[PDB]
Amino acid sequence: EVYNKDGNKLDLYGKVDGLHYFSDNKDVDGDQTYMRLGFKGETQVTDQLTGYGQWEYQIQGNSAENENNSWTRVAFAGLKFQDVGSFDYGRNYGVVYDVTSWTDVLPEFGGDTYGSDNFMQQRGNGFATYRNTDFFGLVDGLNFAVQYQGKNGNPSGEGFTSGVTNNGRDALRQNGDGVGGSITYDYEGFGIGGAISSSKRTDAQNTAAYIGNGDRAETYTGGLKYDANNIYLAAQYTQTYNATRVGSLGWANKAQNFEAVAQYQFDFGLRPSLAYLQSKGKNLGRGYDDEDILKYVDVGATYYFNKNMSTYVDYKINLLDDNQFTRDAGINTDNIVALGLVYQF
Amino acid sequence: EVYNKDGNKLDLYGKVDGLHYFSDNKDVDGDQTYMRLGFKGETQVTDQLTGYGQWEYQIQGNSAENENNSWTRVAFAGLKFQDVGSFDYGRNYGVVYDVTSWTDVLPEFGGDTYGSDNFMQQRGNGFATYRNTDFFGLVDGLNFAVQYQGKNGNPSGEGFTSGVTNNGRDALRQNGDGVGGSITYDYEGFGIGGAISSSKRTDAQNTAAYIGNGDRAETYTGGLKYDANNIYLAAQYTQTYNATRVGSLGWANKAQNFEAVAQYQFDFGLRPSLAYLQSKGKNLGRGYDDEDILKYVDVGATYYFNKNMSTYVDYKINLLDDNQFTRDAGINTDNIVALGLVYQF
Amino acid sequence: EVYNKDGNKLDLYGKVDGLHYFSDNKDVDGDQTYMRLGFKGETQVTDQLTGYGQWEYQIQGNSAENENNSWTRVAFAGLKFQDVGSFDYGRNYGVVYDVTSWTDVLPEFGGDTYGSDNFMQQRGNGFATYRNTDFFGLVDGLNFAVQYQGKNGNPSGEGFTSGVTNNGRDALRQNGDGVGGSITYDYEGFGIGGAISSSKRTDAQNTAAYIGNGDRAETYTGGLKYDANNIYLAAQYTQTYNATRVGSLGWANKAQNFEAVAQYQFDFGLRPSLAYLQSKGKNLGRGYDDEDILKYVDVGATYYFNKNMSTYVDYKINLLDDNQFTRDAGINTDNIVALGLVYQF
Amino acid sequence: RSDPLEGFNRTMYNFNFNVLDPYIVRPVAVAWRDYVPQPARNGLSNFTGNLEEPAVMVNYFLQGDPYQGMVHFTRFFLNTILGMGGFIDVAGMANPKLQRTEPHRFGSTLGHYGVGYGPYVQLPFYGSFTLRDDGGDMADGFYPVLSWLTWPMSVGKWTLEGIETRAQLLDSDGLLRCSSDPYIMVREAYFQRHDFI
Ligand SMILES: CCCCCCCCCCCCCC(=O)O[C@H](CCCCCCCCCCC)CC(=O)O[C@@H]1[C@@H](NC(=O)C[C@@H](CCCCCCCCCCC)OC(=O)CCCCCCCCCCC)[C@H](OC[C@H]2O[C@H](OP(=O)(O)O)[C@H](NC(=O)C[C@H](O)CCCCCCCCCCC)[C@@H](OC(=O)C[C@H](O)CCCCCCCCCCC)[C@@H]2O)O[C@H](CO[C@]2(C(=O)O)C[C@@H](O[C@]3(C(=O)O)C[C@@H](O)[C@@H](O)[C@@H]([C@H](O)CO)O3)[C@@H](O)[C@@H]([C@H](O)CO)O2)[C@H]1OP(=O)(O)O
Ligand SMILES: CCCCCCCCCCCCCC(=O)O[C@H](CCCCCCCCCCC)CC(=O)O[C@@H]1[C@@H](NC(=O)C[C@@H](CCCCCCCCCCC)OC(=O)CCCCCCCCCCC)[C@H](OC[C@H]2O[C@H](OP(=O)(O)O)[C@H](NC(=O)C[C@H](O)CCCCCCCCCCC)[C@@H](OC(=O)C[C@H](O)CCCCCCCCCCC)[C@@H]2O)O[C@H](CO[C@]2(C(=O)O)C[C@@H](O[C@]3(C(=O)O)C[C@@H](O)[C@@H](O)[C@@H]([C@H](O)CO)O3)[C@@H](O)[C@@H]([C@H](O)CO)O2)[C@H]1OP(=O)(O)O
Ligand SMILES: CCCCCCCCCCCCCC(=O)O[C@H](CCCCCCCCCCC)CC(=O)O[C@@H]1[C@@H](NC(=O)C[C@@H](CCCCCCCCCCC)OC(=O)CCCCCCCCCCC)[C@H](OC[C@H]2O[C@H](OP(=O)(O)O)[C@H](NC(=O)C[C@H](O)CCCCCCCCCCC)[C@@H](OC(=O)C[C@H](O)CCCCCCCCCCC)[C@@H]2O)O[C@H](CO[C@]2(C(=O)O)C[C@@H](O[C@]3(C(=O)O)C[C@@H](O)[C@@H](O)[C@@H]([C@H](O)CO)O3)[C@@H](O)[C@@H]([C@H](O)CO)O2)[C@H]1OP(=O)(O)O
């Protein structure tokens, strides 16, 4: 908080993380430090209408001084009314990520099932999110929201024709026009959430160079949560059809992923964590059958010195094989252990 | 303003807006969400000397996570005395931009007759501006400025045997050593000003068939403005020789840009707008005799909430016709409707 | 500075510099304005253990709109105890720079004998530096530190299967696992320090395309300082083996760097400067035998208007000659005039 | 005390101060003080003084003055870059102790060790002239920033200082008129104004 004027409350935040990787695989070995910066403002227009905006930038310091690797995580703005809902437009998280974030509580790992700009699963460009609080002021804990996704095609710089958009990207991040919604109910201590999304698939993702062909990408996502007496227990299980990114090969026809976490909070600051993730496929093509995209167990602990500096240790025990499918898709197999500290201001 | 001590005051500023383009042209439609970030700090050395600086950074939030589309707009520093004028060196707008800004009142569109880093028309590098206010404290409203231009040319690291510069770029924004000046007059609502620009052209701009070839690129800019009784009326007619950028073909030998605006802010907050733009090319090369470069009429309105939050709708009616000249240059000839939500802090 | 509550404090800092170079080399001539921005946070965990953070970003303002040139200079975080030392991990300065910083008070042209990520001579990645103040509170002025550097090799994912890391770069700045430490002693005004470094060399730097082949790269540096009676005199001698970079053709097998500085502080703000930099390469494996690399004399002065705004003037006297070795190495051998105007907020 | 050539070179001084002065210099001084705006006069005075700024440092270095020599070093640098070549007195306003002082030409350096003024000779259309101070003033023409000056425009630069000096002295023009012997009064004032500085 650096500004507390009349309806100009600006909260500047950010963090810097210095992390190192110790794995047998040379693809991810070495330093893994990064940095995040952003702000979160809020404007009180009146007693009912209230404007707000959020922004976050990530700058990676792993590269040298001759190159830069930076990207925008979330960038959106909108208005928030009173006891009737709120609407905002820009780069924000999807409705599915609202429920999946309960399980994704690991310090460094976690959330590897989905990828960036992977339909309505993580942060993306052109999201029209409508959020309502307390069900228009009727019940407590019952929150529901809807979202919309724009159509993104090939970049206009190169000649590709067909679907062309100004914010062009690679064929692994293109998406069409879809509509999704979510509804969560939160009681005291416990909590149950669920989301359903369906995004259109562009014509450039149905070629013969990428696995997975279809017209729609409707997904069903569940989840449970429990946060009471310093005990954090959450479980979730999604069912995505032609929406799970295997890697460089393309998208799996049908992949079922189940995640569960178990964390405890101590008085001195230690926060042990334990998670299990599986991404075994069902109807993989190109001769594959019942292949596992990702399967690992994360065990570690987090020590909180204060509200600004935190230390954690994470050990990723990979439980997947090293067959031809793993090498073709470029999936890591060696175990990764990372320890470091992050300072937040 | 987040810091103010011992004379030095820092005033952080910026804006975040989510934009989306709806048009029949596939090269411009899609998400265009960007943001601006910077600070405006100043310090007082003594009672007769004041220092100041300005920085700005534009980051496009519509790009994916594997690429970055961020760039700087203005970055300059200087010192200002009590009343002798003002001098600053760095990245800043040209003297002509101080006059053409009267018609640059549209929220998003407008000002398409010129381009960035195009001689003394927009923000560039190596700009030394000496601006005097109130004519050394003699007559109120009479101001003039003297500017200088560097010798930026071909890139140094591209292995060019001709004149090269460290901050090189493509053969579309290079310019020679030029000196220009402008004079502006103010009154009770009514305003009248003029600008004069003349910059040399590098030898790299006359190698290929760039259509516009000449030793010097003169530019005469004139116009008037009227801001009184919540009524905003202005006009501007410029005659630029080898200064306006046609597109991917080169430069126009003679262009007659004309643009006028008409706004009237209501007491509620609505500010309807109605502007028309025209750009007739003369003495064109490559067989073209007389073809229009830019001709459209823009209509829209904005509604500020309290001081910063505003919602605006734009509708550009392109009156240009598609032909061989427009297809080669790459100029859209179809109507485009845009919607945005700008949040300023 | 901008936020101080609940024991957490922030110190926003940075500068905006508008640079202009006057030289006939055309490789550095032109406007080279840049920008510096960063923060320095600090938290109070308890009465004995404290925390701090430092980050800095450099953005070049001389680029155009279609290109971006920026990099992260320093980014690290860690804790700080009361009287046993402080430990921090991330991007920071090496132990060799702690002795060479006494002669690096030059305004613009200083510390040109080394480079970033060059055998632990400047800012690098994966720097875990532990520093003790006042020798655990025993004596005054005896400061020593020890740090370790990780192994960085070829970039990952581009035709590389050996020496692969996630933070790879070009072979001109690769480094191995090296350990080094420095010890300083400042009793009253006068000071004497030294640093011993030994960094391993990767297999990519031992090829025939670059000069200098060895298992370990040793580096011994010594220096002296004196800051009293409003005068500043310092001198340092550096002896590096396969550590100093010489152009893009590799590294010198044996170099004897010697840098000295001389500055004076006046009551009205003028700070004259004078430096003599000498570096003679020895045992070159390309027929160049004993030559002179990067030899120049720097003379100039700096005027300080206040504690937040200052200006400086520099004049480099290049005594080196233009020969065959200079042509294929890319070494400036002519006088360069540089002027700027910094503004620290 | 006494100076040679007292009877001679005296009638021309009266003519230049009672015929040429009230008919050519005085009429143009009134118009210059009124018609020319005050900011214009200040800018011209600062620009003229900045041209001789890199010459005072050389004079101070010969006699020895590290404190005073560096004072004028930053005055020219700030006025050339941040003052449009001397139009704005950046260094003077930046520090109350860095204001512009009297010009110390080569005559002051020669007088530091002690040099007699010699005979007194009055030059036409110029006023008082001395072999030590005014005679030695033609020594900075070889130094940089001053050798580039051409002969035609150099004459007009001196005339600019005379108009500015005469305009400021219009308020005290009655002191010389009421003096019984203006030649004696103007001789002592010239020697005291220059002295050894
Ligand atoms: C609070 C918000 C929260 C959410 C709100 C509630 C949630 C529900 C809302 C969503 C549900 C809608 C139903 C649906 O979503 O439907 C289904 C899903 C069904 C499930 C239903 C569940 C519902 C859940 C409800 C929950 C309740 C609890 C899937 C689908 O999405 O259907 C798909 C269709 N899209 C829609 O239906 C969305 C839908 C949207 C329509 C847009 C309306 C205008 C926007 C309003 C702005 C709002 C203001 C804030 O429309 C409509 O329903 C009309 C209704 C509008 C309502 C939605 C608007 C949302 C905005 C919200 C903002 C508040 C789509 O069709 C065509 C679309 O093309 C246009 O682009 P272009 O014209 O090309 O530029 C426009 N594209 C857009 O993106 C619009 C825009 O970007 C996004 C919209 C806005 C979003 C951001 C705005 C927010 C910003 C605010 C910031 C503050 C769009 O409209 C247009 O025109 C629009 C027109 O321009 C411009 C309009 C003017 C603007 C005026 C504004 C100013 C007002 C003035 C005020 C003063 C138009 O629809 O494509 C395929 C069809 O396949 C084809 C085809 O045949 O076209 C086949 C193929 O064709 C061939 C051929 O045959 O030639 C075949 C081949 O042989 C071959 O040759 C190829 C050849 O190679 C190339 O040709 O071509 C090929 O061409 C392909 C693609 O083109 C290229 O691959 O498409 C369909 O798949 P399918 O149906 O499943 O099969
Ligand atoms: C408070 C702070 C105080 C201040 C800070 C510190 C101050 C002191 C500095 C440290 C002492 C210096 C000693 C030294 O510096 O030592 C010498 C110098 C001699 C003395 C000089 C003076 C010293 C005293 C000075 C006094 C001053 C006062 C030189 C050298 O450096 O020796 C070198 C060796 N040692 C070290 O590097 C340091 C060192 C290695 C460190 C290992 C310890 C583990 C880390 C501890 C974690 C920290 C705790 C927080 O030493 C060790 O052992 C253990 C000793 C422990 C010390 C390190 C602790 C650092 C922590 C800092 C503080 C936190 C090194 O051995 C092997 C290493 O390989 C692994 O990678 P891989 O996994 O295999 O990929 C791991 N690599 C690493 O980097 C580890 C990591 O990145 C660094 C860690 C620290 C950095 C960050 C810390 C901070 C983090 C953030 C904190 C917030 C590493 O561990 C491993 O196993 C795995 C891993 O760690 C263990 C897993 C993790 C376990 C713990 C984590 C969990 C914690 C639990 C918490 C609850 C393992 O040891 O390699 C070469 C050999 O050459 C080869 C080779 O054989 O490898 C030959 C060649 O091979 C061939 C082959 O085999 O055929 C031949 C070819 O023709 C061809 O065929 C190919 C074939 O195609 C493929 O093979 O390959 C080729 O491959 C080449 C390179 O590829 C190319 O150049 O390398 C040696 O050179 P040489 O001896 O000179 O010849
Ligand atoms: C707020 C202030 C605003 C302004 C204030 C009032 C407004 C008036 C002032 C501006 C207008 C000037 C008039 C004009 O604008 O003039 C005309 C216009 C006509 C009249 C209009 C008047 C309007 C008036 C309006 C009034 C309004 C009130 C056009 C033109 O611009 O003339 C042009 C010339 N003049 C200028 O550019 C500016 C200018 C010349 C510059 C004068 C010296 C610089 C002063 C330093 C600044 C001080 C800092 C404050 O003007 C001058 O005279 C003197 C004036 C001084 C002004 C500059 C300073 C401004 C800063 C002010 C800040 C306080 C220029 O000549 C040559 C120049 O080359 C050098 O580079 P080099 O390194 O040597 O290569 C230097 N280059 C520079 O840029 C200097 C520098 O970057 C700019 C400085 C300012 C910028 C930043 C300042 C602020 C910084 C930050 C501050 C915090 C420069 O100095 C030199 O020597 C060396 C150097 O400076 C000196 C070293 C530095 C010393 C001082 C530093 C230390 C001081 C402190 C110590 C205590 C030198 O003059 O080039 C072409 C000629 O064409 C050729 C040629 O023949 O050379 C043809 C061609 O040749 C051939 C050949 O050889 O045969 C033919 C071919 O077939 C082929 O074979 C090629 C072959 O392939 C390759 O060779 O070669 C080719 O080579 C080409 C190019 O090289 C390559 O394409 O050039 C002319 O075009 P043309 O006349 O139209 O034809």
Author numbering:
A (entry chain C), B (entry chain B), C (entry chain A): 23 to 367
D (entry chain D): 11 to 207
Sentences from the paper on this structure:
A really striking consequence of this placement is the mismatch between its membrane-spanning region and the thickness of the bilayer, leading to local membrane ‘thinning’, where the outer leaflet membrane-water boundary prominently bends inwards all around the position of the ridge. Our structure of OmpC3-MlaA in a bilayer therefore reveals a possible mechanism for the initial steps leading to the removal of PLs from the outer leaflet of the OM. We hypothesize that forcing outer leaflet lipids to bend towards its ridge structure offers a mechanism to favor PLs with flexible acyl tails, yet exclude highly rigid LPS molecules from, entering the MlaA channel. Furthermore, this effect facilitates the destabilization of individual PL molecules in the outer leaflet environment by reducing packing/non-covalent interactions with neighboring lipids, thereby enabling spontaneous and affinity-driven PL transfer to MlaC. We have also detected densities at the same sites in our OmpC3-MlaA structure that can be confidently modeled as truncated LPS (Kdo2-Lipid A) molecules. Interestingly, these LPS molecules appear to block possible site-specific interactions between OmpC and MlaA in the outer leaflet of the OM, as previously revealed by photocrosslinking studies. We therefore propose that in the event of perturbed OM lipid asymmetry, bound LPS might be exchanged for PLs, allowing the latter to gain easy access to the MlaA channel through the membrane thinning/funnelling effect.
The outer membrane (OM) of Gram-negative bacteria is an asymmetric lipid bilayer with outer leaflet lipopolysaccharides and inner leaflet phospholipids (PLs). To maintain this barrier, the OmpC-Mla system removes mislocalized PLs from the OM outer leaflet, and transports them to the inner membrane (IM); in the first step, the OmpC-MlaA complex transfers PLs to the periplasmic chaperone MlaC, but mechanistic details are lacking. Moreover, MlaA itself forms a hydrophilic channel in the OM; it comprises a ‘donut’-shaped architecture (constituted largely by five horizontal helices) and a vertical ‘ridge’ (formed by a ‘helix-turn-helix’ motif) defining the central channel.
